[PDB]
Design a binder for these strands. Structure first.
Lengths: 87, 87
DNA sequence: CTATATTACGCAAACCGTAACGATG
DNA sequence: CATCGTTACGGTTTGCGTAATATAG
């Protein structure tokens, strides 16, 4: 897993199609499709139903999505805590 | 912040010095020092006091160590779930 | 002279963006 | 056949490991 994959996958879930997701992240489309492939590979599971319209989430997608949000939340807060702890 | 920095940090924290963590992660020592620099910069905090005898954690680092462990654990379990939900 | 950390340098692998191709409602 | 997803390719960057540098016992 990479932090980058989590952010990208969250955006794709919220967008409903990979092009829109890319525009929201300020990258080109191909990094989106490739990073999703690496994620699905790394997890051993299909997160996304592809069509020419866009994407739907699988059961394993809806599961993962919830946890991706929480890993990002926790990473963010872990930083604020450490910085606070300095003082 | 990257997952690899979290693993490396935990290993450095447990080991008491960078050389022994390096061996336990099966990499040379310079990635360890460099990835601790990258991590410290990205958080904007100092986690470790370096001496010639090894390392000791700051307040900031004791905090971050616990959350490091939470994040990785949560990342592990989130895999397991997503695979389980694909049954 | 050992043990630790850091820095320098060279080469390989990863990663992005443009461009081409493919597939489908 | 218009629109989105994927794959190819070239060029930049990141990132390793070996070797060198610096400090301390």
């Amino acid at each position: 897993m990479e932090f980058r994959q989590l952010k990208y996958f969250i955006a794709v879930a919220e967008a409903g199609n990979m092009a829109a997701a890319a525009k929201r992240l300020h990258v080109s489309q191909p990094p989106i499709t490739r990073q999703m492939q690496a994620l699905e590979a790394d997890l051993g599971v299909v997160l996304l139903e592809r069509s020419h319209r866009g994407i739907e989430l699988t059961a394993a997608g809806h599961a993962f999505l919830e946890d991706a949000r929480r890993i990002l939340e926790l990473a963010g807060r872990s930083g604020d805590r450490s910085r606070a702890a300095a003082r």
